[PDB]
Design a protein around this ligand. Structure first.
Ligand SMILES: NC(=O)c1ccc[n+]([C@@H]2O[C@H](COP(=O)([O-])OP(=O)(O)OC[C@H]3O[C@@H](n4cnc5c(N)ncnc54)[C@H](O)[C@@H]3O)[C@@H](O)[C@H]2O)c1
Ligand SMILES: NC(=O)c1ccc[n+]([C@@H]2O[C@H](COP(=O)([O-])OP(=O)(O)OC[C@H]3O[C@@H](n4cnc5c(N)ncnc54)[C@H](O)[C@@H]3O)[C@@H](O)[C@H]2O)c1
Ligand SMILES: NC(=O)c1ccc[n+]([C@@H]2O[C@H](COP(=O)([O-])OP(=O)(O)OC[C@H]3O[C@@H](n4cnc5c(N)ncnc54)[C@H](O)[C@@H]3O)[C@@H](O)[C@H]2O)c1
Ligand SMILES: NC(=O)c1ccc[n+]([C@@H]2O[C@H](COP(=O)([O-])OP(=O)(O)OC[C@H]3O[C@@H](n4cnc5c(N)ncnc54)[C@H](O)[C@@H]3O)[C@@H](O)[C@H]2O)c1
Lengths: 264, 260, 259, 268
């Protein structure tokens, strides 16, 4: 191991299965030395999270639905009693109504708008606020975003609006926690075939488009994103805060399909 | 007049008093020949909107609170019956808790976050759903935003997060409706002394900082924002959509305190 | 007309023929009341600029090649003698080796890099140096840029690097001259079939890609860019400076193929 | 050792002294296992580079002035004979007339504009041209930029125009070389007291301003930039290209001084 998180203790929310971006981050951080606490969303997720948590010599700290303030408080109560401190926090939580991830953005329902904003955006602020006084000087908070916050990606619709709000909240949070040297950053990941991302209409097309048009000519993996997360969670990135870090084979820099790019 | 909106018909939501940005927009648009309709938020706002509408020979189409879906349906039904089609729409509505626009972003309540996102962001999508039906022949939709959507500005907090979502929704809406040639744009205005803008704490300092450090060495007025709105509402800008247009004396371009 | 430039006088550099973006700017500005002066780049351009200037009752103030500082001085002397003051200036000048607007950016030549940077970027600062003396009462300076400054557009290559420097210089000039109320802005135009743009490798493809995928589902014209330029040159935009303004049917906002 | 650059060979251009950003990058890359080669710009620089190179078990591969294309090809000939392949390249080179890093950008001279663009921008493209054949199995190319490319920083002037071109060239190069898995990125560094940066007018004001107004309430060090560079030069960042990575204590995210942040008074 590289020892980059030796003796560090961190909390990961959003582990769903062994395809989760959160699982890539967990494997990498654990190999780097971190002891990891995991939450789970509802009893079903629990049976899948438990053997994964055992595999990284971490542990399951409890149920957390981020719309449930009491479940947030309980999780951080557990951490406080068990560790008395928290070195880093990974926010890998996102939700939007899969039915409305298609057609036109203008046709979304209000309930989908409110639910998407609350689960995908406010939850990072709620978690950071509850975590602030537990967090060590020099700590690191990490969330995940997508290029659809910057440019219009079809079928991503209200989630793009939500991710633009998430990236802005990262900057405001970074200013709030900066004097405590707690950094707040986001990885803008390229598309990866996960449970939640499968709900996007025509996701197969989006993957191939990235494979054909991204500079590196391939899509990224949870292990690659995990290594980039390790950098932002470790002291290697101690002067980096408020940053949207693209881990996407360079896709975000292209302004047009290559004329000789193959047709999908 | 310059005739840039001659014969055009537009709906303005968000006129509150004679210092509103919406009032600068209304005055310029009327002088350019537009027929204007106005909503009002509640009975106390109605008392101020009626004489201002009279001054520009516009008309008041009724009460609209954007948290009340039925009232949105009602004012758009009124406009549809009177005019049939709409040429432009101005969305000058924003709201956030005044007491939390001071102190730390991280300290905001969930209720304030959700209310701000709904009134300041969702409302544009809610209104555009209805307006699209009246703009089959094309049109222009305009909202208002602020540099705190791009960079951290003191005391703007959750409104900065909300305006970042608003600017993104402008681009998603512009993609939705572009094939119908309905354009959707935003003006990123500099700070101006209005009623809503007075709630932001330390506002006097924000104004002076812009006055002393913006390239043009002065803050902007509702009449200047009105003239930029006129461009975006008129056919002059017929190839512009999804744009966030800074009308801020250039403040958004500086990276540090000006030299003098 | 709309009168937006009534009583105003401006200088336009970069008119090549009746397809130039500068020609759309000229026609619109003339219809809005502006008195216009034009330069030309050499004898071949002169044969078209002179009668075109006549069609908008404009003034031909002479030859200007922005690589030739003496010729810049002479046109501004000519302007100063005739007018005294200048209300606005249009910089519609760009150049690169068309043979290298293809293949890989990394294969460009050093001489092409330097020539492109000089003609396409430094020229705006050089022209602004002289316009400043004539713009004591304020004014508006406009240049033209392209989305290839922000994101990679294939075959645009060193012109993309150049336009990124241009957009930055617009902002630094805006800080310099803003206290004198001289505004400096750029229009980021969508692709248009002009003499200069036609040398871009696979330019037809870039046009069609924009036609099929821009929000408005069409490319833009010199008359549409001219109307946006009118706004930025007129007092309607008197609180706008340092701005990069997209006139491109919304193309710059998309992140993937349209559906 | 963390071993993140175990067995890797890299070339570093731009080491001037023990305060250079390139020195921080070199110390970190060497600690992580890298075998390093250094150029020097002239004889006065050579006197400082040779002992610094020895300190990191590095090796000096000769004189390079990027306005002299013969010297570029010479050092890449030396590298190709000693090593054959190259894993990473560090471009820590910038220049502009320090007498004009003050007053108004509109008053710059044409020769200063052209010389700044050539040394500070085209040099990255020229170096990458040669490095391409030595990086046939992939690699990582890193340059340094500054937030004055994005927003106006007074007295940075033509250097900000140049850094905007440099950042664009990073993206175009990343597209060119991506298919060969050669990544091209930039670190946007916050201000650091170095030889070159000291030429900026009132650079101490820019430093104090960053200390009070950056989110982390401090300016950055060459060791911190070195650690961020380690990430971009190593396989940990193998899916990252075309990136402008801010290592600036977060300064770039600020849109206005806080109301209660200090108003700096100055004395002569
Ligand atoms: N997969 C991609 O292509 C991609 C690309 C860019 C960004 N991202 C982001 O990565 C993050 C992780 O998603 P993923 O792709 O790994 O998918 P995933 O399905 O593995 O993870 C999403 C997680 O969100 C959790 N979640 C949803 N609503 C919740 C709630 N109310 N309370 C608590 N937890 C809740 C789920 O339990 C799940 O663990 C998301 O923020 C997503 O937007 C993903
Ligand atoms: N004033 C500035 O300095 C400034 C700067 C940048 C952007 N803006 C934006 O300009 C817009 C107009 O603000 P202003 O400065 O003219 O202030 P204002 O006080 O004159 O107008 C705000 C309007 O919002 C309306 N509104 C609020 N909640 C509503 C609801 N639930 N339903 C219906 N209407 C509702 C009010 O009725 C009022 O007319 C806002 O979106 C604001 O964010 C203002
Ligand atoms: N046409 C497009 O698609 C497009 C898109 C974005 C931006 N632009 C920009 O618009 C501007 C005008 O170009 P256009 O498309 O109208 O083409 P054009 O061929 O009509 O005009 C280009 C002009 O540049 C002039 N020029 C070149 N080198 C010169 C020199 N050394 N000295 C003086 N003048 C010189 C030519 O004489 C000509 O008048 C350029 O800056 C171009 O990059 C064009
Ligand atoms: N120091 C800062 O505050 C700061 C901030 C942001 C970015 N940067 C960038 O970091 C890089 C390194 O600068 P530094 O601060 O370490 O300063 P430095 O003085 O330590 O290094 C600058 C180097 O550029 C080299 N150089 C200049 N002209 C050259 C030429 N013609 N040929 C070859 N080499 C040449 C010098 O020999 C020197 O080694 C530069 O690109 C600079 O713009 C510095």
């Amino acid at each position: 191991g590289n020892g980059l998180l030796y003796g560090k203790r961190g909390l990961i929310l959003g582990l769903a299965n062994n395809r989760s971006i959160a699982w890539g981050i967990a494997k990498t951080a654990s190999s780097a030395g971190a002891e990891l606490a995991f939450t789970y969303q509802g009893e079903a997720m629990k049976k899948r999270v438990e053997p994964l948590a055992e595999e990284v010599k971490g542990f399951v700290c409890g149920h957390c639905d981020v719309s449930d303030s009491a479940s947030i408080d309980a999780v951080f109560n557990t951490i406080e009693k068990k560790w008395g401190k928290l070195d880093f926090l990974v926010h890998a939580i996102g939700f939007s109504d899969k039915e409305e991830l298609s057609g036109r953005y203008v046709d979304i329902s209000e309930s989908n708008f409110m639910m998407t904003m609350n689960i995908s955006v406010y939850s990072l602020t709620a978690l950071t606020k509850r975590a602030e006084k537990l967090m060590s000087d020099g700590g690191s908070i990490l969330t995940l975003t997508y290029y659809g916050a910057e440019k219009v990606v079809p079928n991503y619709n209200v989630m793009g609006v939500a991710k633009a709000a998430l990236e802005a909240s990262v900057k405001y949070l970074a200013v709030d926690l900066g004097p405590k040297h707690i950094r707040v950053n986001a990885i803008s990941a390229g598309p990866i075939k996960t449970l939640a991302a499968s709900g996007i209409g025509d996701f197969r097309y989006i993957l191939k488009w990235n494979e054909y048009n991204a500079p590196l000519r391939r899509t990224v993996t949870i292990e690659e994103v995990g290594d980039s997360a390790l950098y932002l969670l470790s002291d290697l990135s101690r002067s980096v805060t408020g940053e949207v870090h693209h881990v996407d084979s360079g896709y975000n820099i292209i302004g047009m399909k290559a004329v000789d790019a193959p047709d999908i």
